[PDB]
């Protein structure tokens, strides 16, 4: 096993290469290990920021909306996340 923060770094590496699929794989694993109570400097909101965008790029529309809502719930002053939420809610008529 890699640590939570290692997996997060892997997900960020994939994302910075424009590899959204591998971003999802790593960030999903991060969330699993955070839910298991593993210690980490990375926060769930930071993971959700990468993951929500990556799942959208892969065409997973209502999941991207769900994760964007969760992101904002944990980071309400995240202006970009708020803009994303408005986009997805208008796109999917989920306003």
């Amino acid at each position: 096993m890699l640590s939570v923060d290692d997996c997060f770094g892997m997900g960020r590496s994939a994302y910075n290469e424009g590899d959204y699929y591998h971003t999802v794989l790593w960030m999903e694993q991060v969330l699993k290990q955070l839910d298991a109570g593993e210690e980490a400097t990375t926060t769930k909101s930071q993971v959700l920021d990468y993951l929500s965008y990556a799942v959208f790029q892969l065409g997973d529309l209502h999941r991207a909306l769900e994760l964007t809502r969760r992101l904002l719930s944990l980071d309400p002053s995240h202006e970009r996340a708020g803009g994303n939420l408005r986009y997805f809610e208008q796109l999917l008529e989920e306003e």
Partner: peptide, 9 residues
């Protein structure tokens, strides 16, 4: 264009 924006890096 009209869309979301992810982390800059």
């Amino acid at each position: 264009p009209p869309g979301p924006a992810g982390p800059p890096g």
